[PDB]
Design a protein around this ligand. Sequence first.
Ligand SMILES: [Mg+2]
Ligand SMILES: [Mg+2]
Ligand SMILES: [Zn+2]
Lengths: 286, 149, 294, 154, 131, 110, 166, 244
Amino acid sequence: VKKGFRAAFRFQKELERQRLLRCPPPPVRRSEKPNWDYHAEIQAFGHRLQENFSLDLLKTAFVNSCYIKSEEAKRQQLGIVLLNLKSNQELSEQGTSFSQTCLTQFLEDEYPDMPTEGIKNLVDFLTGEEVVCHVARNLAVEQLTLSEEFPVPPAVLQQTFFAVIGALLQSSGPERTALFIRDFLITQMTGKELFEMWKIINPMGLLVEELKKRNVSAPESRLTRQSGGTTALPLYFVGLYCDKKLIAEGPGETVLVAEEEAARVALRKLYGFTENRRPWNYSKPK
Amino acid sequence: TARGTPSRFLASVLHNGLGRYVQQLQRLSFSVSRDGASSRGAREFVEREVIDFARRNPGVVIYVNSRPCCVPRVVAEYLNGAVREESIHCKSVEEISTLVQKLADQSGLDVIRIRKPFHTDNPSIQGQWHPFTNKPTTFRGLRPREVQD
Amino acid sequence: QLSPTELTEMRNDLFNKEKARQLSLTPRTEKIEVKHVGKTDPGTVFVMNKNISTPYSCAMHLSEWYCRKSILALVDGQPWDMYKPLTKSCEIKFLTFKDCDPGEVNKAYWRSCAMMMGCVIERAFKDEYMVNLVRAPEVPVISGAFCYDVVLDSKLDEWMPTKENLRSFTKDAHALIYKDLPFETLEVEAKVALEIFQHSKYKVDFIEEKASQNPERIVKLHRIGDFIDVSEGPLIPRTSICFQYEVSAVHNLQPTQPSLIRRFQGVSLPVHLRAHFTIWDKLLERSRKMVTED
Amino acid sequence: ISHGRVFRRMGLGPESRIHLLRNLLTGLVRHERIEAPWARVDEMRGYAEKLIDYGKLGDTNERAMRMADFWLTEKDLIPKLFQVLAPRYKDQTGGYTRMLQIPNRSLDRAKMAVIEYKGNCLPPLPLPRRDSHLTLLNQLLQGLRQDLRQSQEA
Amino acid sequence: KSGTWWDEHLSEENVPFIKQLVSDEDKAQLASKLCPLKDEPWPIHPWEPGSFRVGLIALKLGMMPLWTKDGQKHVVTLLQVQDCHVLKYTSKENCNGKMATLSVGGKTVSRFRKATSILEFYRELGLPPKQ
Amino acid sequence: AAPKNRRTIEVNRCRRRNPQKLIKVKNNIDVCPECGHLKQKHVLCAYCYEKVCKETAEIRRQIGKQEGGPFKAPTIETVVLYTGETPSEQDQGKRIIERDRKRPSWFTQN
Amino acid sequence: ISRKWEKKNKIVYPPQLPGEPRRPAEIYHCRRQIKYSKDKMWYLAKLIRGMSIDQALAQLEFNDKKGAKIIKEVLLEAQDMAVRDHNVEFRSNLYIAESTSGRGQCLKRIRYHGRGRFGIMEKVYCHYFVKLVEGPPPPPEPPKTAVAHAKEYIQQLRSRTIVHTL
Amino acid sequence: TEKEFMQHARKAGLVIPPEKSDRSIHLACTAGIFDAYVPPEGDARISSLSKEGLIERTERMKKTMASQVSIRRIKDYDANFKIKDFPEKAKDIFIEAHLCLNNSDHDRLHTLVTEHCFPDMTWDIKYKTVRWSFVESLEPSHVVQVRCSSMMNQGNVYGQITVRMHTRQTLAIYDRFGRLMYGQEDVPKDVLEYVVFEKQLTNPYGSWRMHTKIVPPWAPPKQPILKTVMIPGPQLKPEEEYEE
Ligand SMILES: [Mg+2]
Ligand SMILES: [Mg+2]
Ligand SMILES: [Zn+2]
């Protein structure tokens, strides 16, 4: 037994770290953890995003219907004044309707050749359950959200996120809130292809319909490049020819896959969603 | 070490700075001691510097909990969820002021080796090179020493 | 008229509804003191559940060895299927292929192969041809083959299977063996049984025959996966029991002018009684010869 | 190189090999069933079969008496050989003893076997029995045999 | 999951029959090849210089002295040829060699102790397996 | 000759856990038809062999009480008798061995 | 010393929800201070690893090693314990999940050599640990086939990028 | 090389403490009931006939002289005691004692049950989860029999009161892994049991605790368990032969 407290104390802390790794504790809300003030954390929320939020409106944006129902049940167990808290259902409807129309406005102006179904999918993707939740969890939205179950379900988190837009829409107006959608939702399709967000089936069948609307004859698929046909690792470049004019060329391991990819390349050029398209203009409006 | 440590590619939080810049720092927790020489520098930072620092960073909530402790610490929480804990045990006012300022500028991502000093979502504009980029086409696309009809 | 792809859908629904009804009739939990009577482990008493526990479940209590070799269960001197739930407390006794007098075991296995062969007949032919099963003649084991009466479409009046077509049935039968599908037996009233097989008049006559013999007029229903057929007596527990399986040949019964009835023949052997390739070829040749019940 | 060697190398030498088998042979005659290591039982089995052959020559044969005198250490068993074992196998011409393997002994996990003279009064051993003629495989072969014989007749 | 042999499940009455059954079949199959020039033989070309014909598969019986008319003594080896048949023919093109390969088998062996692939090979040839 | 270097555990595992060193699974185990205990195909049942030796020892103990000393081997056949039995027609002029116990079922009187 | 394996049987799980699947029964049993080498014991524990409870007993019954009798006695008392105390419906349903050997407390003796030399002989002891899980043994992993090899190889060729560039 | 294992502990007896000792073990509860009580056959039918049951309980106490004087002994050590409050007090003790089993509150259960009753309750539920509840009460409890111990058997006097309870109860027992093992947590069923209590009258700090339960020979069979069981026959050595 060697005299000394500092070494023994330091070893206990190391053991505690190992205990956490072996048996991690269940996750808890940031509110329950020490150094938390709901009034202070929500004031900084507006300043962090550089917006003139309304405290009364924003405090109602994080309140969920499930939270109110569970909170009332807590008082019944103790028999305990009435709460006038308002849920975010009213604000979420305002934000969701405005966001879809604002995204539709932005996408239709940027891509005039994109069909309405194509624009609908992109708005359904940017406002989708995964994109909204990914943006919400990195803006301290889940921390301020008053939910009944932790972690916040993705459906609950998506609805709370649009309530922040609804609170922002009333306080700052539509022009100011339009930049909020562009700076957080439009930037979510930067490194993404057209059909990676708008998943389609049989692009060749969709390509034939598009050329009928433009009075263009059906393309003829021909082999432009070929390599390793008899091997298990071939390379086929099939090209679509309209009136003996190449409109797109697609690669693939086999001929059917290459032709399907060639159709996807043709659709991207028609809709103007190619990789070569000019980037979204994030500069301040003039 | 690079082989003995993890690594990541250069990236940002929600494409920060593309349309607007959002300060990734979210919260600072200072635990100073009323009595104790270790927190003498931290106490002087709270007396004159933390007040003016809050003005320059309105989006960051600062907590100053005065409780007995031997090693004063600063806890920094970022939007992406990473928590960074640093000790200001026996540090002068200038050292703490510079240390706190560095925590404000960081994005919260792990401070590990970055594989590339650059990152782009559209590396090519004229088309990524493929073996047929610089190969001419032949009449009827015939293969070398292939007879047709 | 219902399509062949959907005809089996409704048969299982009636089978499932009737099988689930019998569970509902059984109380929440009823105990039956099953007593083991055998040369192995004398005096063992199994406290099982009524209409839920099966002789296979009793085997799992003793050892895994019973679960593999107990092809058939003998309850109170009467054969009992391994997966057939027990109705009352009674003495129990298991049977294997290798016994002093495996007469009952061979019959159960022999009928099982006939039922398995019937399953692949309904799938081999095209959906345009009308193939309706008739019955499985209860031929003796010493006859050398098991047969299943089948009547085909009028178009195939003179079509005779070839060597390649017969090999196709074997691959279909082996695919059934690899699935290891259990034999599920269900004793139902003839009135309920007639409802399932209304379309097939060749089976209605067979069901009515069983109703006359049995005073309670209960008809046994056996199914392999989705295929459902009417058979007499207990069967083997699973399709994996048979190791070597091969259809020998197809012969046409007489008279043919009033109706054409074909006899699909074959020979099979289980894993417990595997035979050598040289010996197996001898059994194939005999099975190709037409056999008629006494 | 050991090609054609039929006799095993046991005991402390060629003489000790005979004495080890002689003790087993003498113990086999007295009890008509003994347990011993499998190799020693198999090596002694040949001498057990030929001992009865000398026993059938009769006690009046001088040569047969000398073989019985040597191979039976206990002299009370010599009258038994010429009056019990030899008359028992009078109709038989071979196969006087049956050799069966038994579980290895716990002492040294040695391969053990039991050798007995047929017709003894001791409780029967659980002899290995082939599958009954009523089995599924036998019935298929029984039916095949009937058809081949019937077709042969006609 | 356990291996088996040909007479594991056979009863006391079937073992003599099974042995006799296959024994009769082997006699018939060997006696069905006694007319090679009558069962559509291949064309018989005359001998040419530089030609190579097939050999046999003999069984070494033993040795026996043999004297000549000059008084010298020679010892010879008795090679008995039994159940020697042509198994299969491989053309020069498929041989991947200058010559053409011809398969020959010697000495009948039990069908119960052979592989399934070998047994089915001899089944279509109509000959008992060769060692 | 002494080792030049210490062999590592990684080298040792490849030698110790090699499939040759591992115990081979036996596939010749089957249940005894008589008692149900486990046995091998080429070996007599251990349970069934033990019951024969237990009965054989009792029979051989009865022989010792009749001979009453060594070098007294009988020159006639021997017959083992149990309670409730009488000497047979062929069991005449033989040494009857009485056993005060019921005849075992597996022991068939011949 | 450590006796955690005994304590692994005393953990009680919360009652399962009606929609939750059936939880397999886990039985932890061990025998301490077996006068046997742990290295020799490992071969017997490796043999019955992954086997059924009845299949494991059959292999141990005809095995000539001394530990085979010792392990078989442990399995019999573990099979009895599962039905008697761990609420297991079928004793044969169990299969071997974990079976390993461990070093035990060993003695030290002196082994005399020639020329007045000596060596230190140890009387080795071992522990045997077995875990039983209710339910049929999991099927062995099928050997990797050509299609599995081909699919993986092409995936490697598809995941490669242009390195040391943009 | 002479070191050896410390295997030296030997078996000993736990029945009796060392002899010639002034200290002796103090017992708070008696092993068994002083006089066995046999409820009349068919008392389950009397449960439905509440009007007849009320008459019988009062008459039996008056017609039993021995049980009537035992109540006098109880009030000799505790004047403020009534037999019209004890059956209502017994219900709270009974329910509270079975509510500690779900939470494994063995610290307080010892104050509600005796040292003899404790092993019967907790030993079989050591590694099992019990969900027991009291749904409703059908018939009020009645003090059937009161019998006390002999005066100064070992320096202490014990008194036992028999109480009959007929109430609906819900029992849900889960095994070590949380799987359902016995009973249904939804449907309650009626239970008719005779609870016997005890108290050490000589001890000033004593109190009435549950002692045991009377199980009549005419009691209906209990609820069958969900799983199946096997009862193996006698193990037979090779020399032994089975007898039927
Ligand atoms: Mg040799
Ligand atoms: Mg010396
Ligand atoms: Zn046996």
